[PDB]
Structure formats: C-alpha cells, structure tokens
Design a protein around this nucleic acid. Structure first.
Ligand code: MG
Ligand code: MG
Ligand code: MG
Ligand code: MG
Ligand code: MG
Ligand code: MG
Ligand code: MG
Ligand code: MG
Ligand code: MG
Ligand code: MG
Ligand code: MG
Ligand code: MG
Ligand code: MG
Ligand code: MG
Ligand code: MG
Ligand code: MG
Ligand code: MG
Ligand code: MG
Ligand code: MG
Ligand code: MG
Ligand code: MG
Ligand code: MG
Ligand code: MG
Ligand code: MG
Ligand code: MG
Ligand code: MG
Ligand code: MG
Ligand code: MG
Ligand code: MG
Ligand code: MG
Ligand code: MG
Ligand code: MG
Ligand code: MG
Ligand code: MG
Ligand code: MG
Ligand code: MG
Ligand code: MG
Ligand code: MG
Ligand code: MG
Ligand code: MG
Ligand code: MG
Ligand code: MG
Ligand code: MG
Ligand code: MG
Ligand code: MG
Ligand code: MG
Ligand code: MG
Ligand code: MG
Ligand code: MG
Ligand code: MG
Ligand code: MG
Ligand code: MG
Lengths: 129, 394, 60
RNA sequence: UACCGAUUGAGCGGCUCAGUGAGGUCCUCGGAUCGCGAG
RNA sequence: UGAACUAUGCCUGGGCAGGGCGAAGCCAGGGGAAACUCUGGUGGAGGCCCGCCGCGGUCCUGACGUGCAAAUCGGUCGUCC
RNA sequence: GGCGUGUUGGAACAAGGCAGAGUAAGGGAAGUCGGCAAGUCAGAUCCGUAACUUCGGGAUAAGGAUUGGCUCUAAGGGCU
RNA sequence: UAGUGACGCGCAUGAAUGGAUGAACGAGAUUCCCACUGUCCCUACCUGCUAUCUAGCGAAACCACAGCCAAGGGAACGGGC
RNA sequence: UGAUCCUUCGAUGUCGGCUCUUCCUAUCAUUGUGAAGCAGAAUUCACCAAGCGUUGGAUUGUUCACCCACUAACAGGGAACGUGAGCUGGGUUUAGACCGUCGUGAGACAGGUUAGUUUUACCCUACUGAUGUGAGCCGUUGUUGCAAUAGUAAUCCCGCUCAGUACGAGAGGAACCGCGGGUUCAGACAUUUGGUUCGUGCGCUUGGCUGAGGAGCCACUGGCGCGAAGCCACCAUCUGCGGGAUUAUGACUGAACGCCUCUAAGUCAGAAUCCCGCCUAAAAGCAACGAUAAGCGCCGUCGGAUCUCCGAUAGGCC
RNA sequence: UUCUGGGUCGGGGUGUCGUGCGUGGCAGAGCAGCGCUGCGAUCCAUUGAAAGUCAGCCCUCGAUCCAAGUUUUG
C-alpha cells in the first residue's frame, strides 16, 4: 500500500475529530496492524486506521469504541519526493471497519497518504493537501 | 524463573568481537567466483569517501505508487582516481587452503607507492626494490623472470594483481598509496597472466572495472566512537531514574548458574571502527574527472540530460572536512561505512543480480550542489551572484 | 522549484519543509529560520534580509 | 403521579466577560497606468 | 561520681526584616414613625496569613555511606508576637 | 575592609557517576506500588471570584486583562 | 481487586472503653479531572567536578593454600578429587 | 503442594516487579507433511522441528487472576521458586500509632490500617574491550596475503494480480508464479528533516559596574531569538544473500512370501531444522616478497685444526 | 632535512546572525529657550552592512620563518 511515514500519534493521544458526527476528540487506544515490541507504544500516522474513544461530544458517542482514521498530524513525515509535510493539528475521522465514514463532511485538509488508501474519505475531503 | 515477557536479543552475535579493527583499509575476504568464459577484468577497486548529496530522478517501476514520478535519493560520492598496477601474484590450491606461489613486481615503482613499504620515509634511504628492479635490464635476470611467469601459467589457479592508488591526486595530506590484490576472474590462467603482464606500471580507470546501474559491495572500516556504554554500544534499555549506582547499565548480567558471565551478555567497551561489508550498493553515476579538452578545464561531471548546466560535483565551498574531487568519482545510492576521506574497497557482487531493483536503469535529472557547510541555498556561485546582485566587496 | 513563503527564495526539491493549516493554505519554508519567524507572526516586509523587504525599500 | 438522590448528571436555548477578529466607511501616502492633472 | 549533653522548673539578661486579610472603638454622609439600618474613611485586634535571620528537619527514601561528619551536605519543606 | 577558591599542580574530555533543580521533535502519565522526580503557576495593577460555613472564613478561590522604552499632560505641598 | 454514593442477621459497628457530624486548618492516608512536563514511547546532545593520565604524597577492609570449565561421586550445589 | 530434616543458625540477604542473557519442548504461530464425521473457507488429531516471534493497557504489592483493544500467534517452563556489593521497597518482616476480636491484666492476631537508614569491590577469576607476549636467533624490519578454529542472522505480515476462479444447490470462497510495501531484528549512515550548540558564532535584553558616547565586563553558562561544525533519532536515509547431505512424508525397482509390498540389497523427491557459503575475529599456525647498517655475512657441504653445548640413534628415502 | 618540504599570518570561497561605529536628514510622540537652536525612545541613507568562519570547513602560492638529529636493532 502506502510507504512508511513518521509516526507521531502513540496510544493515549487525543486528536481533533474533523467531521460532522458530533464528536470533538478521539482518544487513541490502539492501532491496526501493530504486532508489538516489549515496551513500545503503538504509534499511528496519517492513513492508519485506529481504535479511538470520544472524550468530548454527543453523549451517544463518548462511551464506546470507534474505528477512526488519522487524516492529519503535526509530526513532519518525508514523502518520496523529499518533501517534509506537517499540519498544524492532529485530526481523525470516525469510520467503519470497511473504511466508510460516519459523517458526511470533513473540516480541513486531508493528507494525500490518507486519501489514496481510503477512497471513501477522499470523496468527502474539502481539499487534499 | 523464565523471563516474564519475551523480547528479542539486543545486537547480533555474528559481529563479535566488537574490537578496533587491526586493519585501516578494508579487506576483500572473498572474491567473486571465476567464470573462464567472460573476458579478463578486475573484480575490485579502491575509493575514498568524499561526501554525500541527494539527486532527483524519475522512477520507472511498473506496479509502484511512485512510478513515472520524481524522487529524491540520498547518494554518496566516492572519488576513484585510476590505480597503477605494480605487481602480479599467483596462488596455488592446497588441501589446507590457498598458498602464495610467487610474486612479480614491475621495473619502475612510483615514489608514492614505495611510501607504503616504509614507516619513516623522511629519514630513510629509499632503497626499496632497488636490487629487484635490476632483473628487467640484465639479460640473465630476464631469463629467470620469464621462468617465473611461465611457472604461474602452470602451477597457479588464482591470479591477482597488486595495484596502488595515486594519492598524489587527492586532497588528503597523506602521501602513501594503498596497495591491494585485485583478483582477475576473466579466463584461463595463461590469459590472466598475459593480461596482467602487459598492464604493469599502467593505469586502470574506474570506467573499466565497474559500469552504470550496477550493484557492488563496499568493504570498509566504520567510524569509531571510542569506549561507549552498554546503552550506546548494544542499545539496551535505560534503567529508570531512581536507579542507584547508575541507570545506563545492564541490570542482570547472568544467572547464578553458570557461575560465569556469558559472551552473549551485552557489556561496555569500544564501539565503532569495525570492519564491515555492505552489499547491493547500486551505482547511480560514474563521473569523469577534470580534463582540458580544448585548452580550458571542463567541470560537466554533475550536469544531466535534463539540467544542461555547467556545474561540477563539488558543492559550494567543496565537500566539508574532505575537499574537492577532481578525479573520476563513483556516485553510490545511500550511505557508506566510514568517515570522510576514508578508503573504501569496492567489489563486484557475489550474487546474481536479476531482481527488479538490481537491473533498473537510472536517468538522473538533477544533482544537488548546494553548500553542505550549513543551510546552503544556491547550486552555483554564478546563481548566487545573479540572485543577490553586486555586494559591497566590488 | 517552489518559492519560500517567508523569505521568497527558491526552494529546491531536496531542501525545505512545507506546512499546511486547517483553512487549507500550504506554505513552503526554505529553512527553520523562515519557519520559526512565520509561526511567530513576524512580518517579512519588516525582516531586513527578506526579498519582500528589499523590494519594499528598492534595494535591488 | 410528583418529590429527595451520589453521578463536578446530560441535552437544548437567551443575554454577556475576555481573546481572536472577516468585511465595509473615513484618514494618512501609495503611483500600476493614462492624457501639470486625472488616477 | 556525674544535669559542660539532654528533660522539666526557678532567678536574671538578650533577640525575632518586609508585606497581606483586616476585628472592637470613632468621624461623616444617606434611610426611619420609632426600633435602628446602609456607604465611605478611620482605627490596628489575632496561640491570624506569605516570608528573611532564627528555630525546626517533610520529601527526594538525593549526596555521602573504610564520609567533611561515630548523623553531615544540597534542593525542597514546617513555623516565625 | 578582607581574601586566593579552602589538606596539592600539570595534560586530557572515554565509559560510568554527582550536579547544572541544562535542553528537546510528535505524543502527554501509555512510566510506576504511587505524577516519585521536575514541569507548569508565581511580582504588581485593574476586573472577577462559587459549593459549603461556627458567618469569622472559604480566597491570592477559580477565571481574564495590563506591564518595556520615550515624549508630555493632570492631580496631590510649604513659606512670605 | 482501586475511588465514591447506596444496600446491612454487622465472623467481630455503636453511644465520654464516647456515637453521628463538621466550617477552617494539615511537610497525615486515598481517588478522579484540567493544565503541565523526558515518568514513558526512545533515547540523544552540551557543560562543571570526578573517574582517566602524570609530579608529589599515600592508606584500609580482607587473606588456610589459592583462583579456567562440564559431568560424576561426596556432608545430597567443587576450585582442589 | 506435602513427607523427611542430610547440608547451612561465629548469617547462603527473603515476595513481586524492572532489567538482561541462555537453555528445555510437553509446538500457540510460521516452514515441510500425514489424518478426518478434510467440498471450499474455517477447524480438529498427529509427525519432523525450539530456527524465529510470542504485544500495548485498566484494577491488585501481588506471582495467580479478570477485562479492554491489537495480532501470524499473543504456547508452557528452567537456570539457588535465574537475577538486591543490579535497582526499586509496594508487600511481608523490629521499635511509633489506630480499630476489631481475645485476655482481669501485661499483651496476642497466621486480621485490617499508616509512617518506617536497603551498607562495601581497589582483590582473584569470568566477561567486555586495550597494550604486549613463542625470543632460540642471520636474525632484525616492512608490505601483500593464506587459514585452522570460534562466533554467525534474519524474521513475519499485508496489498495488487491469480479471482469472485477452482469448490458449492446456494450462502460463501482459496492457492502457486509474479508485482508493490510493511512488521520485528540486525549492520551502518548525517545529503535531507529534527534534537543538541560554552566555535560563548551573531542579534537583542534585565540588574549592576568602568564619569558619559563608543567598546565591554560581572550574576558558578544572566536571560532570550536564530545557529555552523561535530555527535545524534524507525524522529531522517540506505543495505540485509546462496548451496549441500538429509528428517517427517510421499514414491521407484524388487525379493523375503509364484502374488503383494517404499526395504531386506539397491535408488528418487524432500523442509523455518542440521552443516557450509556470505559475514566477524585471526593461533606458541603459515606462505610470497622488499630492504638489510674499517664494519657484516657467504664462499671451498673440502673448514687443515681447536673449544663448548643439546637430542636421539647403532645398514636402507624398498 | 633543500628537483624542495613543512608551519604561522593574510587573501578568496563557503556558511551563521543580521543591517556595525561614525556621519547626514525639513523622518520623529513632543518639549524647552531666542524663523532659528537645544533635549528626544525610535526611523531613514551610507549598509544583505558589521562581526566572527577550523581549532576536526574549502582553495591559494601573496607575506615572513623553519629545517634538526631520542633510544635501539645482525
Ligand atoms: Mg513494560
Ligand atoms: Mg595527498
Ligand atoms: Mg535510591
Ligand atoms: Mg552539513
Ligand atoms: Mg524578654
Ligand atoms: Mg489560607
Ligand atoms: Mg526559615
Ligand atoms: Mg535553616
Ligand atoms: Mg526535636
Ligand atoms: Mg536536611
Ligand atoms: Mg539516602
Ligand atoms: Mg560510594
Ligand atoms: Mg558523562
Ligand atoms: Mg542528570
Ligand atoms: Mg519532549
Ligand atoms: Mg505498566
Ligand atoms: Mg497506570
Ligand atoms: Mg514533587
Ligand atoms: Mg477550595
Ligand atoms: Mg486508576
Ligand atoms: Mg463505601
Ligand atoms: Mg457488636
Ligand atoms: Mg463493645
Ligand atoms: Mg469502639
Ligand atoms: Mg496554613
Ligand atoms: Mg500534618
Ligand atoms: Mg491534605
Ligand atoms: Mg502543623
Ligand atoms: Mg571454594
Ligand atoms: Mg539437620
Ligand atoms: Mg517433539
Ligand atoms: Mg490421537
Ligand atoms: Mg523448583
Ligand atoms: Mg529467587
Ligand atoms: Mg541490596
Ligand atoms: Mg529479590
Ligand atoms: Mg547478586
Ligand atoms: Mg514498606
Ligand atoms: Mg496487604
Ligand atoms: Mg510495627
Ligand atoms: Mg498485620
Ligand atoms: Mg457466485
Ligand atoms: Mg540541524
Ligand atoms: Mg545594561
Ligand atoms: Mg555569589
Ligand atoms: Mg542562573
Ligand atoms: Mg535552537
Ligand atoms: Mg537439497
Ligand atoms: Mg522411506
Ligand atoms: Mg535424494
Ligand atoms: Mg554592536
Ligand atoms: Mg578533538
């Protein structure tokens, strides 16, 4: 799939929910595809699907476990063309196990490393950058 | 009693003992297997690590997400001036390993090559090979000299070549020359001796040893770091802050029985300056040194088919801590062991290169030449003066 | 070859570090000195070594 | 059917502290450009 | 045989920056039919508060641990009419 | 006023310690028996301060704003 | 398995062997939240004093003899057999 | 977990965690296979097999449990119930104190609770590195190498294609080749990004000081912004491999036993295992070769003769 | 240890910070004396100027010096 990027969102990182679902935060509790080291925290970059819990938002969303997908991060990751890109906030969107989002819109830009892996997130992205 | 949670080992036991290498120049411990059908050629070459840059090239890789797109790959420049062949040596196979049969040196040996034979050259009468060079002139000594070559074509199975680098054409203040046995893997023993007899006291450029888009092995000594702790030498986990009597150690160095410390326990000692061998170092560009074509010097060894500039491979202010490369250099993909101005022994690959990444052709589009002595932002001095305009220094 | 969003210099494909905001604007910075001044809300027309300053006071 | 009740209970509205502040309007000067003036 | 250390009592001397909240009493101006109230200022009470010297000795289970020291050192910390 | 750095000088700047309460990308207690450790806050001015209470308090509660330099203006005295 | 609010046939709560409650107070014990941070992910770099080397000076604990291992037997885990 | 009481009471530091190494297999996963109430997918039983991996967390001092997610799988253990001159003292396990029960009482608790000094290595081995050492000397000295032997390293997953195909009434639903990445690990490296910056590099700035300007100093690095060179991070980048004999197993030819039979004689395919290559070290192991200072060897094994030592042996390299 | 070779300064390149002292101005909130003059943070020109840059950066061949002799080896 995608190449490797600089992971900057370990477990226990609250990121801004960037859709119209009603949530405001996403408390990352794990990352998909992580085998694991002895004391290593599962970190996540853009495009990676993570299991996150809502800490601020509607009451029907902040006591469950939701599969989210990171779309932005502040840790500068190097693309294959030598570009070190980083955003001003860590953001994610609540999706399903198939990748389909729960909302309809996305507030802010979506990284290209996340738009090419998830075609359902790129279709609701305001600007892919 | 077993460890609570399993964790893989720290470090590889296949690189022990981690000591200072007793040999500054890299050593070829295994030359490629001979194929008597190919023509006669060299299988190794000595270079000097000049520095690193990054290039821009469009990747034609069917199936990848970066196909038909430009990338930025870090490269390493290894200056490789031509080497002069001075001696020929042959080996005979014995049931207890190879054995040196006989060595034959040339008549004229350069002064920078004799410096290798001495430890104090400035106060020594340079008499090395003064009585040996008289064999090529005396008619009786030439008869015995013919008996030595004709003996190698009969009793030897592996013929090598003693060649040295011309450190007269390098920025380093060292004037010695690195001798090296480069094995001939071309053909019959009779053909390899004749090929090595006509090449005595002659230069061999880098363009003949290697070629474009070829994966070679780079043997060299890494950079030393002195005595380092176990957390820096073996990358063990640092103990918590409240640990009495040090937190950068290994807590348990072994069980009660065996009542000894195992050799596999990570200890504190000297890291770096180890002899290492890295494989699959693909050649990106074989540059041409400076040469006067029509009375004026040329420096087009960094221009590409897509750039068409007039800049040399040397960045602004030359390579930091090395100097400037004016000879035939070799641009390799990625990192290379050793510090700057470190002697590297290039070598052809033992494996068969048939992978999609090994037989890939490289078309460079842009070679960076910004000053590495800081955040440089100008490729050439002419571009720096054209953008900034005239200064007060005029 | 992009232009730096603060100093106005030319950024080559190997150097630089770009930075996108929530509103959707992407800025390219040549080095960390231009990035640190941009995030500090410094004005390029007041920074004396910027091309926007030299174009402001007609130094070239 | 209302009431008390840990849960800094939860949700939805009105008016506001502070910060940030788009966009007009005036005021200072700014001169692409056009034929001293219009800009 | 010892109260040159320490425990308690007695006699006679010495000592304890700079700030904070700010009680009774008093003055003045408003409300009242009287009972009596409200605002500002004043005043400077207290085993009161922040805190220096002093006097103590919490935590780091720090330093030291054949020590500077047969109990000390550093930061932090308790109290200081 | 006093002193030569507190029972010694010189040359190096490896590991490992003690200390500087050194600094740090992204995350922010996931470390750990436990926020141990130190990090944030901190002066002063102007605003604004709940539950509870023995009505004394809580209280510097919490939560905001301002602060340099320079040139002026206004107000607050004494004596004949 | 923690904390808090409730439930009480409570092994073995209970009324000056004092019960219940409690504003203020606490270098007392405990839980959660906001902010914060190298506690951690995951270590890296710099500095002072040491360690290091050197001139001078110069101890002590300790010590049957001593000091490479595997297995065996043995006072049932040798260093010596 | 007992039973025993042989060793240890002029002392073997004692529960758990942390850390780190190694071994065992009674194999959870991966490699190669056999079996089914194996159609496919999934799963179960068994075999060669320990090469390799076996996680992050809430609560508990806890080993042990239980739940939350992740994962190819989150297998079970040993090494003085591994490991305190390695750490942390949470627990237990002195002295302070509180409660409950018990005792007339002093006090008890294998019950609960709170606070409670964790000392020493400079010795000998072991191990990690660092000098050097056969000294018998026509050997001294240098270069280029050989190699015994020892270490040894890679691992696993996903996506695309195969393919919506085989298979199945459907629902569902693979695999090989090939391609593109990644996990864990290993060895490096600093072009780039990021960290550090007492080149005390440059600017600025607080208090004080030199009469002031200028230039500077002091506050154990005054503070702040930027920052070169070095060093550094899966926080950047690069590289990581081929054969041999075979195990399990499936077979060939073919008797014993007119047939049959993988076995008895003789053969074949065969694997994350094993051995080796690659890679790391280089021996009281060695070769080729350079030069070797009246002084310093050889020549003419004829030494013509003198002295000192050290082994053997007592016709044969048939 | 003189076909010369090796140092110390200097020059150039490079990069770091960021527009130096002085001088000039009818730029400057203003203010005080007799249009003028003085005080005045800052601003502008000179000035991408100044400063420092291998000690482990690069290249010179400009300046001025230096060339001796520890111990031992058949
Ligand atoms: Mg852990
Ligand atoms: Mg040279
Ligand atoms: Mg401790
Ligand atoms: Mg650089
Ligand atoms: Mg008194
Ligand atoms: Mg108070
Ligand atoms: Mg005090
Ligand atoms: Mg005191
Ligand atoms: Mg006391
Ligand atoms: Mg104390
Ligand atoms: Mg202590
Ligand atoms: Mg000590
Ligand atoms: Mg250190
Ligand atoms: Mg420290
Ligand atoms: Mg940080
Ligand atoms: Mg934990
Ligand atoms: Mg926890
Ligand atoms: Mg604390
Ligand atoms: Mg309160
Ligand atoms: Mg908790
Ligand atoms: Mg309760
Ligand atoms: Mg009772
Ligand atoms: Mg009772
Ligand atoms: Mg009672
Ligand atoms: Mg108090
Ligand atoms: Mg208290
Ligand atoms: Mg308290
Ligand atoms: Mg008290
Ligand atoms: Mg013993
Ligand atoms: Mg007994
Ligand atoms: Mg088995
Ligand atoms: Mg069975
Ligand atoms: Mg046991
Ligand atoms: Mg034990
Ligand atoms: Mg201990
Ligand atoms: Mg223990
Ligand atoms: Mg021990
Ligand atoms: Mg305890
Ligand atoms: Mg307990
Ligand atoms: Mg007790
Ligand atoms: Mg108890
Ligand atoms: Mg179908
Ligand atoms: Mg940097
Ligand atoms: Mg000052
Ligand atoms: Mg002082
Ligand atoms: Mg200070
Ligand atoms: Mg910085
Ligand atoms: Mg085979
Ligand atoms: Mg068989
Ligand atoms: Mg076979
Ligand atoms: Mg200055
Ligand atoms: Mg140095």
């Amino acid at each position: 799939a995608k190449f490797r990027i600089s992971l900057g969102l370990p477990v226990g990182a609250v990121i801004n929910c960037a859709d119209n679902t009603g949530a405001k935060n996403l408390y990352i509790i794990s990352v998909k595809g992580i085998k694991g080291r002895l004391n290593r925290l599962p970190s996540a970059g853009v495009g990676d699907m993570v299991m996150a819990t809502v800490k601020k938002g509607k009451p029907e969303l902040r006591k469950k476990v939701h599969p989210a997908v990171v779309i932005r991060q502040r840790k500068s990751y190097r693309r294959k063309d030598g570009v070190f890109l980083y955003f001003e906030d860590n953001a994610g969107v609540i999706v399903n196990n198939k990748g389909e989002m729960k909302g309809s819109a996305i507030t802010g830009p979506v990284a290209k490393e996340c738009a090419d892996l998830w075609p359902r997130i790129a279709s609701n992205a305001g600007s892919i950058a | 009693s077993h460890r609570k949670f399993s964790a893989p080992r720290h470090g590889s036991l296949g690189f022990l003992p981690r000591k200072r290498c007793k040999r500054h120049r890299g050593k070829v411990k295994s030359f490629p297997k001979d194929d008597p059908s190919k023509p006669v050629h060299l299988t190794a070459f000595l270079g000097y690590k000049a520095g690193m840059t990054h290039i821009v090239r469009e990747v034609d890789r069917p199936g990848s997400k970066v196909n038909k797109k430009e990338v930025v790959e870090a490269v390493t420049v290894v200056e490789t001036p031509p080497m002069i062949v001075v001696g020929v040596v042959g080996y005979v196979m014995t049931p207890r390993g190879l054995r040196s049969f006989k060595t034959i040196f040339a008549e004229h040996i350069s002064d920078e090559c004799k410096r290798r034979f001495y430890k104090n050259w400035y106060k020594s009468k340079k008499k090395a090979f003064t009585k040996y060079c008289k064999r090529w002139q005396d008619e009786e000594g030439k008869k015995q000299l013919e008996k030595d070559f004709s003996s190698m074509k009969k009793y030897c199975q592996i013929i090598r070549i003693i060649a040295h680098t011309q450190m007269r054409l390098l920025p380093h203040r060292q004037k010695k020359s690195h001798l090296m046995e480069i094995q001939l893997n071309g053909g019959t023993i009779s053909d390899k001796v004749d090929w090595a007899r006509e090449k005595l006291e002659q230069s061999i450029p880098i363009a003949n040893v290697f070629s474009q888009d070829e994966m070679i092995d780079v043997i060299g000594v890494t950079k030393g770091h002195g005595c380092k702790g176990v957390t820096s030498r073996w990358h063990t986990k640092k103990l918590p802050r409240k640990t009495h009597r040090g937190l950068r150690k290994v807590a348990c160095i072994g069980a009660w029985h065996p009542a000894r410390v195992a050799f596999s326990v990570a200890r504190a000692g000297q890291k770096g300056y180890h002899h290492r061998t890295e494989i699959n170092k693909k050649i990106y560009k074989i540059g041409v040194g400076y040469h006067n074509k029509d009375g004026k010097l040329v420096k087009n060894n960094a221009s590409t088919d897509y750039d068409l500039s007039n800049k040399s491979i040397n960045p602004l202010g030359g390579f930091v801590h090395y100097g400037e490369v004016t000879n035939d250099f070799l641009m390799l993909k990625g990192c290379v062991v050793g510090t700057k101005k470190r002697v590297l022994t290039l070598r052809k690959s033992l494996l068969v290169q048939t992978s999609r990444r090994a037989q890939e052709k490289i078309d460079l589009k842009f070679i960076d030449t910004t000053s590495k002595f800081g955040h440089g932002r100008f490729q050439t001095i002419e571009e720096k003066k054209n953008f900034m305009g005239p200064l007060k220094k005029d | 070859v992009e232009l730096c969003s603060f100093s106005g210099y030319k950024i080559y494909p190997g150097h630089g570090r770009r930075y996108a905001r929530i509103d959707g604007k992407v800025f390219q910075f040549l080095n960390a000195k231009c990035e640190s001044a941009f995030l500090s809300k410094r004005n390029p027309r007041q920074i004396n070594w910027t091309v926007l300053y030299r174009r402001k006071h007609k130094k070239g």
